[PDB]
Design a protein around this ligand. Structure first.
Ligand code: FMN
Ligand code: SF4
Ligand code: SF4
Ligand code: SF4
Ligand code: FES
Ligand code: FES
Ligand code: K
Lengths: 432, 214, 263, 45
């Protein structure tokens, strides 16, 4: 009837079966692994049926925010006012701890291409723009080899798959900016400007890239869709809990015996992931200090919280953190957590686009303050100031980079204030 | 330094000789036709990247050439040049060593790789070797966090380095030959080092979990 | 007759669709704080000084860029709106130079006035401030660029009103700087208008430098005779001496601009 | 033909060059649809 322990996903129900590149990644291998199967029928069922199945699966955003996919994709169901419509696949993957998108674009690129076709048909888009980060040169070239095979086989382009739908897939490499993972900053980076995010009340579904209706989607969100439509949608919904449904790619990095990328059933306990797939934290589970669950934006949790937490959006939101990109960065007890969070804040300072005052000035301010916190060169009355500054950045910026910089600070202050004050007191004792 | 104001030098000035080779102009033409008519300013980033891949870096003459080719204002090309960190507005070495030093790589001792590089090259972070073969900088996340500390030399990823593997990579780099990218340990791409805790069975054939008529 | 009904602190106003929160507050006589927003320029929405609370909405909105919705109640003086303004002003003043006595903007700044009216009265910034090198864009505009708050008003004006795409931003983050990258003059008949739109002393008039303070000048409203446009101007005088020329708004003739010969 | 999850199958990117991606784009220009047009040649036109 119902599930209560959402783990131990089998190989049969894993979407990304060429995750480690141990099979052919080209068209011939991908076809034998189920790809590009009855795509003509999926397209001919119509956009309404495809979107209905994407809603039935309960799939949410796999690139952070986790907004439901079927509802987001249905903003394009409107009739055309003359302007073109595009699907913009987000392949930037700039979040520290996250390397899951990199693995699809080079070992299952045809999954991404056919997901582009299925989704763009669902949104009624003429072309797909895959914006990959410029650092993924080999992955981008693998993706474009796959796109070339899809074109030469008639699966993309004129009369795509025999459906009569005309669809193009263009790859546009980035040039070294993490802010270009943000959907509107990505849009403006496609348009040849600085990667600065736009103010939202004009939404990408109305005014997107080139000023046309667009939907920006993560690589995994796009790539799972052909298996969602071809396997049932109900089949996808039978994995994980309610709301947060399906399966996810997990990046386990940090103080782990076997850091790895694995596909595990959603709502999996963090313990099962770390022990079964990652081989456990070095020194055992007793040696665990924090774990950052969903990439650098998601605030850390302590070992007590991480002891009995489940890996989905709702369970991790209950734990004052987020699921983010399902990039778990575990830290053993031999870790300077203040140094780690200061390094993350330094990353966010280096990646701020500088457009808006709170991110531009405040993230730099928080980096300056956190650098002192590593040395202890501060008074304990500055911790509350750091909290207030982070809340002043949070909810006051154009994009979510300010929020994702303020959140690691809050997660450090929330669970490791004694360590910060201990460092400050040691510094006061050393420097009289 | 990385200053965001240009100053003319006898090497970097508007009259610095730069132009695209005919093959690069054909590649530019293929790039320009990827975007709708009236919106070809969307090609500034890839055309600038082609300028960098031909010349090695971006002199101000290359920026002006891209602006002329796309009929965008030069200041618009200047903004893109100074915003995206992959654009070399100063010459770099033959091999641009880029070591990731953010937290997931730092926890795997990315500093033991940085110190080995600084010891072998006899150079610091942010400067080139006198033979103009290696430039060393610290970069943010490169999307390879699962692999132990990694570097990007030019276009390739060298992963899970020990303070000895990067020495060998630099040794064969100085010997001219290019090294095989990827993880230098026994693992292949991103799987667990002890064995596959995941897909280990023949993948299902085409049309396995289908429904009705799809 | 297609006007929608919105509320500004409970008071109902009827606005055309597409009217922003800032404009809806403007028609009840309430001026939302702003730095980057100019009504004659495009909307940027970057300074975040116009953030305001929509009743029942957890997240503040940029009043300058957000179109009003039917039934919205703008809370222009709620505590959340005041705290947003105080945080934004704190961030604006974190790296701002302590140049008020030596800066020509002092006494008619905007940063000063909105710090007094909407920000806190004290600092908790305990670090070293930013400093950027000056840019030379001709003999008319003195760019003390470390006073710049990156509102992009000059860039938007130069690109749209003046039609010259010389101004811009280089770099990103905290070290993103407004300028021309290259050493280049900002020559245009309308170049001197980026001085007035600049909210701070980042862009100042070279001829007027160090010469007068705003409070001591007498303002005579007159007409320009350097051309046949008849631009409306204000003549600043002090102790019987003409001090400078400023634009005087006339929507039908010159709006709020004058040419460099007029100025 | 048999199961071969004991070997990497992504060895092509070892032989990629500086112009592999752009050459692939060039060869891709063959089969694309005609781009849409906004009517003008540039927003400054
Ligand atoms: C700073 C920043 C970086 C982001 N980077 C990425 C990224 O690399 N990949 C991604 O898929 N989404 C990224 N996102 C999230 C996108 O903005 C967007 O919400 C998402 O791509 C939408 O598609 P989804 O609903 O399928 O996730 C980023 C967001 C922010 C604020
Ligand atoms: S939050 Fe930061 S990255 Fe996002 S628009 Fe504002 S300044 Fe740019
Ligand atoms: S611009 Fe305003 S706040 Fe800044 S120094 Fe000048 S008078 Fe003071
Ligand atoms: S120079 Fe003045 S007008 Fe231009 S961005 Fe800076 S503060 Fe705004
Ligand atoms: S942390 Fe070094 S690659 Fe992402
Ligand atoms: S005035 Fe609306 S953000 Fe600057
Ligand atoms: K000014």
């Amino acid at each position: 009837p119902k599930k209560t322990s959402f783990g131990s996903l089998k190989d049969e129900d894993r979407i990304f079966t060429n995750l480690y590149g141990r099979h052919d990644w080209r068209l011939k291998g991908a076809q034998s692994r189920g790809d590009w199967y009855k795509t003509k029928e999926i397209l001919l069922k119509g956009p309404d049926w495809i979107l209905g199945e994407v809603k039935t699966s309960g799939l949410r955003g796999r690139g952070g925010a986790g907004f439901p996919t079927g509802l987001k994709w249905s903003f394009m169901n409107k009739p055309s006012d003359g302007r073109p419509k595009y699907l913009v696949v987000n392949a930037d993957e700039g979040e520290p701890g996250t390397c899951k998108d990199r693995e699809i674009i080079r070992h299952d690129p045809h999954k991404l291409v056919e997901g582009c076709l299925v989704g763009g048909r669902a949104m009624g888009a003429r072309a797909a723009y895959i914006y990959i980060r410029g650092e993924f040169y080999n992955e981008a070239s693998n993706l474009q080899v796959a796109i070339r095979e899809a074109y030469e086989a008639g699966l993309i382009g004129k009369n795509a798959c025999g459906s009569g739908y005309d669809f193009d897939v263009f790859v546009v490499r980035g040039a070294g900016a993490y802010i270009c993972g943000e959907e509107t900053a990505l849009i403006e980076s496609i348009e040849g400007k600085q990667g600065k995010p736009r103010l939202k009340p004009p939404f990408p579904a109305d005014v997107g890239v080139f000023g046309c209706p667009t939907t920006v989607a993560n690589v995994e969100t796009v790539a799972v869709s052909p298996t969602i439509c071809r396997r049932g949608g109900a089949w996808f919904a039978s994995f994980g809990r309610e709301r947060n449904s399906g399966t996810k790619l997990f990046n386990i990095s940090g103080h782990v015996n076997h850091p790895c990328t694995v596909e595990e059933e959603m709502s999996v306990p963090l313990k099962e992931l770390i022990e079964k797939h990652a081989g456990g934290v070095i020194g055992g589970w007793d040696n665990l200090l924090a774990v950052i669950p969903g990439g650098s934006s998601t605030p850390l949790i302590p070992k007590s919280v991480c002891e009995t937490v489940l890996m989905d959006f709702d369970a991790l939101v209950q734990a004052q953190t987020g699921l983010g990109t399902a990039a778990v960065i575990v830290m053993d007890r031999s870790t300077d957590i203040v140094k780690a969070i200061a390094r993350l804040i330094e990353f966010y300072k280096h990646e701020s686009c500088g457009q808006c005052t709170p991110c531009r000035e405040g993230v730099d301010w928080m980096n300056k303050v956190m650098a002192r916190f590593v040395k202890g060169d501060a008074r304990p009355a500055e911790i509350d100031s750091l909290w207030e500054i982070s809340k002043q950045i949070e909810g006051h910026t154009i994009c979510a980079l300010g929020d994702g910089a303020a959140w690691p600070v809050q997660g450090l202050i929330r669970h490791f204030r004694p360590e910060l004050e201990e460092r400050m007191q040691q510094f006061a004792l050393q420097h009289q | 330094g990385a200053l965001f104001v240009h100053r003319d030098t006898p090497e970097n000035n508007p009259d610095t000789p730069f132009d695209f080779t005919p093959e690069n102009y054909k590649r530019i033409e293929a790039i320009v036709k990827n975007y709708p008519e009236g919106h070809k300013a969307a090609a500034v980033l890839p055309v600038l990247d082609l300028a960098q891949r031909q010349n090695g870096w971006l002199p101000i003459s290359a920026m002006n050439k891209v602006a002329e080719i796309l009929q965008v204002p030069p200041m618009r090309v200047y903004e893109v040049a100074t915003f995206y960190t992959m654009y070399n507005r100063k010459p770099v070495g033959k091999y641009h060593i880029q070591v990731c030093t953010t937290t997931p790589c730092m926890l795997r001792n990315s500093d033991s790789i940085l110190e080995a590089i600084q010891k072998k090259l006899g150079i610091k972070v942010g400067e080139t070797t006198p033979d103009k073969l290696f430039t060393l900088i610290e970069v943010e996340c490169l999307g390879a966090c699962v692999n132990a500390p990694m570097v990007q030399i030019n276009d390739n990823y060298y992963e899970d380095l020990t303070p000895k593997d990067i020495e060998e990579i630099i040794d064969e780099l100085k010997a001219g030959k290019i090294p095989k990218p990827g993880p230098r340990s026994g693992r292949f791409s991103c799987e667990p080092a002890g064995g596959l805790t995941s897909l280990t069975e023949p993948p299902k054939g085409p049309g396995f979990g289908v429904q009705a008529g799809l | 007759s297609n006007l929608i009904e919105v509320f500004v602190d409970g008071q109902s106003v009827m606005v055309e669709p597409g009217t922003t929160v800032l404009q809806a507050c403007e028609k009840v006589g309430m001026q939302i704080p702003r730095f980057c927003y100019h009504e004659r320029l495009s909307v940027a929405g970057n300074c975040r000084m116009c953030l305001v609370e929509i009743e029942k909405a957890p997240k503040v909105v940029a009043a300058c860029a957000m179109p009003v919705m039917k039934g919205w109640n703008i809370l222009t003086n709620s505590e959340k709106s005041k705290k947003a303004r105080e945080g934004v002003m704190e961030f604006l003043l974190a790296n701002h130079p302590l140049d008020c006595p030596i800066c020509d903007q002092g006494g008619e700044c905007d940063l000063q006035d909105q710090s007094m009216m909407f920000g806190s009265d004290r600092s908790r910034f305990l670090e070293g401030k930013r400093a950027v090198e000056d840019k030379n864009i001709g003999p008319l505009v003195k760019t003390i660029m470390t006073r710049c708050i990156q509102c992009t008003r000059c860039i938007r004006f130069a690109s749209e009103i003046a039609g010259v795409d010389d101004l811009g931003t280089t770099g990103r983050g905290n070290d993103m700087q407004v300028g021309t990258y290259i050493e280049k003059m900002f020559m245009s008949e309308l170049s001197g208008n980026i001085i007035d739109i600049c909210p701070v002393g980042a862009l100042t008039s070279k001829p007027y430098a160090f010469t007068a303070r705003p409070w001591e000048t007498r303002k005579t409203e007159s007409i320009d005779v350097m051309d046949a446009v008849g631009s409306n101007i204000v003549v600043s005088t002090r102790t019987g001496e003409v001090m400078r020329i400023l634009p005087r708004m006339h929507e039908d003739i010159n709006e709020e601009w004058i040419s460099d010969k007029t100025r | 033909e048999p199961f071969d999850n004991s070997t990497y199958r992504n060895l092509q990117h070892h032989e990629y060059s500086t112009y592999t991606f752009l050459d692939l784009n060039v060869e891709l220009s063959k089969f694309r649809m005609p781009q849409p047009s906004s009517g003008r040649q540039s927003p400054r036109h």
